[PDB]
Subunit: 71 residues, 4 copies
């Protein structure tokens, strides 16, 4: 088994394996970034609605107050 | 010739080692960044909640003041 | 939940990163072997061709010694 | 700034992943070359030695026919 034949043999193997690893890695990180993204928006919605309640109560406060005066 | 191989492997590990340390360091920092951003969002959520029930007890009291009043 | 998801992903990364670190640590070690064994056979073939080069070399040094002593 | 902190990290990753890919391709490409050089030089040393042995064998053949023709 020639070293030049052994060296080239490794080069085909590397080039192929390295090509497979990249593909898998890219898809993996895609999925993870996806999970986090979903969780982020989920957290975003919560903060969004929580703020709604607050400003909604604030509206009610100055709504009743707007009626306490004429009272 | 084996002096070429011995040279290569020692170069590989010296780099492979440096690569793992720099990578592990990199991920931990990114995880740190994200962790902080999340906590800040949690704090932000926890706060908007406290400021919601706060506003709620107020209207409960005001609507009571409006009722009893005439 | 971002915090809960971050922890999840963080664990998955540490999970695979260790596995992969081995599928490569072993692979790169099995390959440096093929080249290392090939280089040894190669270094041998030379040490064999060189010794042949000096094995036939001396043979000439004798046939000459016979041709002259007979002519 | 959730979606932002996530996007920043995704960009940093994609950026780092690129440089990691181009530094790897170089490193391996050169290390392979180096090994090819050594396997080539050695290879030549073999052919040079083989042609040398075969050269002498030619002599040993005809030089013997002279030991015969004479004797
Ligand atoms: Ca390419
Ligand atoms: Ca990540
Ligand atoms: Ca950094
Ligand atoms: Ca920072
Ligand atoms: Ca306040
Ligand atoms: Ca905005
Ligand atoms: Sm009052
Ligand atoms: Sm180790
Ligand atoms: Sm670097």
């Amino acid at each position: 088994p020639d070293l030049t034949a052994a060296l080239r043999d490794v080069r085909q193997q590397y080039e192929s394996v390295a090509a497979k690893n990249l593909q898998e890695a890219e898809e993996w990180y895609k999925s993870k970034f996806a999970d986090l993204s979903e969780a982020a928006n989920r957290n975003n919605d919560a903060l969004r609605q929580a703020k709604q309640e607050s400003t909604e109560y604030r509206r009610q406060v100055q709504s009743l107050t707007c009626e306490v005066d004429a009272l």
